């Protein structure tokens, strides 16, 4: 129907906010691992 009374934060329902910092630290770890691979 018309969901105009529903907020914009509820319509996609973007959950999973806990994993983002873990993903960023894993990305930094993989960048340093790639730097270790390129040097040797």
């Amino acid at each position: 129907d018309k969901y105009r009374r529903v907020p914009m934060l509820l319509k996609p329902q973007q959950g999973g906010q806990q994993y983002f910092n873990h993903f960023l630290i894993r990305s930094t770890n993989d960048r340093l691992t790639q730097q270790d691979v390129d040097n040797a």
């Binding site: 959950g15 999973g16 994993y19 983002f20 993903f23 894993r26 990305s27 993989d30």
Partner: protein
């Protein structure tokens, strides 16, 4: 991507538990495959194996102290051999014919296993067994609903029948007390019988303990029993139960009464052979069976209904309810319990809390959606210390070790047998998130653990795999940008 499934070979099938493996295309991403390199006829030897293996199928003699809070399995042929009666109320909900037959070895399971191990030669360790039971005839196991009560009853029936001990197993007491119909006893005046449950018991106990009941000579049994043409008079206890349960209706209805009476008479005289008696739901044998006494106008006789001063056809009424001690089976049981001349029978029993809920108000139960449709209509409180002559053992819910082992067995052995997610492993979360969430939802209650393992299908608010696939797709895109 990296499958490693065409290279995977099947390990050799040793038991029934190893044969319960699905095809490799099912559990390829559910149970992932690792590669190892051993040193035989070369430095690399690529051996692809599974990360998870099935729990070991162990004989009860092989179960030890280090197997506490571990998982073991029983063969399907051992399941047919040791349990012809059946299992508990909800024990067989986790064993379809494809699944392995798994059991958790708890601390109380280890205690009862050593107890049954000492029962097997009781005349040497009689003072030890007296100190264990505190002089009582046996143990009654109580706790909240959905714990390991009936599962431990099947476990101790397995322990007793694996060591060649004569074992009485009532897998559900609600077929006796809360049965289909009640009939008065033929030779016991003032007593009653549950005929169908007695026929099933006389069949299954005989085919369970045929190894020792054939060597059981009849001591106090009349030899002038009624016998049809071509049938042999019973000389053994197995022959007595075969005379009892194998008959044509309605001669079996009185044959079971005579057989239960003389079987309980023959049990009460044996003082040298240990007989373990396991009852699931002793709290139903300690109070009134749901049958009531008939109205005396049924047996008095009527000429007509208009002028006979009767109201059986006009209005219903609730007569006094029949207690369990008026059943001949429980009469023989209480005769063995209360008479102190039997230092031979060990009553390792438990209670059931399978009853319907009531929390102050109650509407009518919806017939489609009702988890308690086969539940008992009792609502009565129970105290095992005051309502039973046995020593009470309190079983609570799972600690995190037993819950972790049980959930690991459930998830991984359901995906290995081709009954879990399988190819759809990428939609459900990993095992740590599932353990955390099911430990929230169940409170580590074992029936709640099984119910929420089945209800994991309809989880709406898990966002782990979505963010993981976003991160992996982004990493793939930046890797392809690095390649360009």
């Amino acid at each position: 991507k990296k499958s490693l499934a065409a290279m995977y070979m099947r390990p050799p099938v040793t038991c029934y538990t190893d044969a319960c493996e699905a095809p490799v295309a099912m559990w390829d991403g559910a149970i992932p495959l690792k590669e190892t390199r051993k040193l035989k006829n070369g430095v690399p030897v690529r051996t692809v194996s599974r990360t998870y293996s099935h729990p070991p199928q162990l004989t009860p003699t092989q179960l030890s102290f280090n197997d506490i809070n571990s998982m073991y399995c029983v063969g399907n042929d051992e399941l047919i051999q040791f349990f012809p009666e059946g299992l508990g109320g909800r024990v067989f909900q986790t064993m379809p014919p494809g699944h392995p037959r798994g059991f958790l070895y708890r601390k109380e399971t280890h205690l009862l296993n050593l107890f049954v191990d000492k029962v097997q030669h009781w005349h040497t360790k009689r003072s030890v067994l007296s100190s264990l039971t505190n002089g009582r005839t046996g143990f009654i196991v109580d706790g909240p609903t959905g714990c390991g009560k009936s599962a431990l009853m099947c476990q101790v029936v397995h322990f007793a029948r694996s060591r060649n001990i004569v074992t009485l197993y009532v897998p559900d007491a609600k077929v006796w007390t809360h049965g289909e119909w009640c009939w008065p006893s033929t030779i016991l005046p003032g007593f009653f019988d549950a005929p169908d449950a007695a026929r099933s018991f006389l069949k299954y106990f005989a085919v369970a303990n045929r190894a020792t009941l054939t060597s059981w000579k009849l001591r106090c049994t009349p030899k002038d029993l009624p016998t049809e043409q071509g049938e042999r008079q019973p000389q053994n206890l197995y022959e007595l139960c075969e005379w009892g349960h194998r008959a044509v209706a309605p001669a079996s209805i009185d044959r079971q009464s005579v057989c239960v009476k003389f079987l309980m008479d023959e049990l009460s005289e044996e003082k040298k052979l240990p007989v373990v008696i396991v009852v699931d739901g002793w709290n139903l044998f300690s109070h009134e069976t749901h049958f009531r006494y008939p109205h005396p106008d049924f047996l008095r006789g009527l000429a007509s209904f208009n002028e006979s001063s009767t109201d059986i056809d006009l209005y219903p009424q609730e007569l006094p309810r029949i207690p369990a001690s008026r059943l001949s089976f429980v009469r023989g049981l209480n005769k063995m319990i209360l008479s102190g001349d039997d230092p031979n029978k060990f009553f390792i029993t438990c209670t059931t809390r399978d009853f319907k809920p009531f929390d102050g108000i109650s509407g009518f139960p919806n017939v489609e959606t009702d988890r308690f449709a086969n539940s008992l209509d009792e609502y009565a409180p129970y105290d095992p210390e005051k309502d039973s002559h046995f020593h009470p053992i309190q079983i609570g819910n799972f600690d995190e070790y037993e819950y972790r082992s049980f959930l690991r067995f459930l998830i991984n052995s359901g995906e290995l047998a081709g009954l879990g997610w399988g190819p759809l492993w990428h939609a459900s979360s990993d095992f740590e998130r599932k353990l955390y969430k099911i430990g929230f939802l169940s409170g580590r209650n074992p029936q709640g653990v099984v119910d929420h393992y089945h209800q994991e299908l309809v989880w709406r608010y898990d966002y782990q795999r979505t963010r993981q696939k976003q991160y992996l797709l982004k990493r793939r895109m930046e890797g392809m940008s690095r390649g360009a």
